[PDB]
Swiss-Prot record, chain F:
Detected in skeletal muscle (at protein level). Fast- or slow-twitch skeletal muscle. Cytosolic calcium-activated calcium channel that mediates the release of Ca(2+) from the sarcoplasmic reticulum into the cytosol and thereby plays a key role in triggering muscle contraction following depolarization of T-tubules. Repeated very high-level exercise increases the open probability of the channel and leads to Ca(2+) leaking into the cytoplasm. Can also mediate the release of Ca(2+) from intracellular stores in neurons, and may thereby promote prolonged Ca(2+) signaling in the brain. Required for normal embryonic development of muscle fibers and skeletal muscle. It is found in: Sarcoplasmic reticulum membrane. The gene is RYR1. This is Ryanodine receptor 1. Signal peptide: none annotated. The calcium release channel activity resides in the C-terminal region while the remaining part of the protein constitutes the 'foot' structure spanning the junctional gap between the sarcoplasmic reticulum (SR) and the T-tubule. Pore opening is mediated via the cytoplasmic calcium-binding domains that mediate a small rotation of the channel-forming transmembrane regions that then leads to channel opening. Binding of [3H]ryanodine indicates that the heterozygous channel is activated by Ca(2+) concentrations 4-fold lower than normal. Single-cell analysis of cotransfected cells shows a significantly increased resting cytoplasmic Ca(2+) level and a significantly reduced luminal Ca(2+) level. The chain holds residues 195 to 243 of 5037 of the full protein.
Amino acid sequence: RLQESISDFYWYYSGKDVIEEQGKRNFSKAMSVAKQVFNSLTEYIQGP
Amino acid sequence: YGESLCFVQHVASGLWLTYAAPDPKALRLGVLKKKAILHQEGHMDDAL
Amino acid sequence: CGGERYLDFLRFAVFVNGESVEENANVVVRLLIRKPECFGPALRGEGGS
Amino acid sequence: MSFYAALIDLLGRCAPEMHLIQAGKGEALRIRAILRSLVPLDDLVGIIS
Amino acid sequence: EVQFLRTDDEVVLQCSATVLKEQLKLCLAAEGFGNRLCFLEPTSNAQNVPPDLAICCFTLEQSLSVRALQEMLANHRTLLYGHAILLRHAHSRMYLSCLTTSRSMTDKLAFDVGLQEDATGEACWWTMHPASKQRSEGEKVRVGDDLILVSVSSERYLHLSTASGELQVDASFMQTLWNMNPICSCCEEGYVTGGHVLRLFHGHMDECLTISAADSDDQRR
Amino acid sequence: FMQTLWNMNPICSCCEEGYVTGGHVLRLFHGHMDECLTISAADSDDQRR
């Protein structure tokens, strides 16, 4: 679901040359959430 | 338990357990219950 | 009688200070077409005066 | 009559503002086409008459 | 493994109608040249009467998200619920579209479904949605899945009209379940596949199987 | 004080985790556990048939 949201928000900003400040912020929030999710998934399997 | 997907078949007839595909106006009744029938082909989602 | 009240609520939701709010207007249109019985026994389509 | 009048008023209010139409915004054009399909003009004129 | 519909695959759109308490399966069909409108070709009596599948076959070009489609208009891939697909008539190389015209005496709000010469615009694009609860948006479309098709331009459903005694196809706010049944996915070089026009040559390509020319006495039989 | 011969016929010895065994009360769910197979409630017209 998160990557679908990120791809949609991409497509929203694709045409515009420069992303604005709020877009940067929301991208940062989404990427932080995705990083934590990736670390959780990594921790589920490591050991292995 | 809870992983295997099973289709119920009447041995003698070979029919498959399926729903009746509620006739229209059932949504108007707001009736959420689907009568169970035995049909030669059935539906894909018939698994249990 | 109740369709009218719900409709004027939606009117106040979508129309502000002489101008339409597209974000709410499009949602209202889509929801209303998805449930077309809100339009009335008329405007139904099939078998509709 | 009041239910239908409220419905028509709400749809007209949901209708796009013109400046978007001149801008050629696809969502606005699509909404307007949907509204026109729902409500034909002859019926509006008949009611006004 | 379970087969997944993907782009460049050829499909037929199939609907089910109950007539005289016998189920009848129909395929969407369009000639394109001469008549752009879509109609329904029954496939059930096939054992006794061959159907015309060539004009019932469609090829998927693109399956995109709504946002990607919006950017495209402003300026192999697996199918997923919620995406917008572009469908070509294989014979006529036109695009399936929701037309502004309406003939349906029964339904006032309905539109005609037919073919479009170019892929430009929103009419040619359609969005797939799951028919049942176990399917959800974002999930891969699977062969045999019942689907709901919505036009971007008109926000109608691809619908089967039984209002008149004769069956018809229309764009309506009422929904009809459709099945995207595959025909071909990927063919190797040579390696004849079914559904293809070809010629039969006896030996070293000197003479071929044929029937009589026009206005012949044999009646071309 | 009179004796009768009896047979001790087995039903189950040891069952692995999950791995449905016969003779068990259970429920049948269509898909993602939203709805289940059942019959009508009490005092229903269908006679719970």
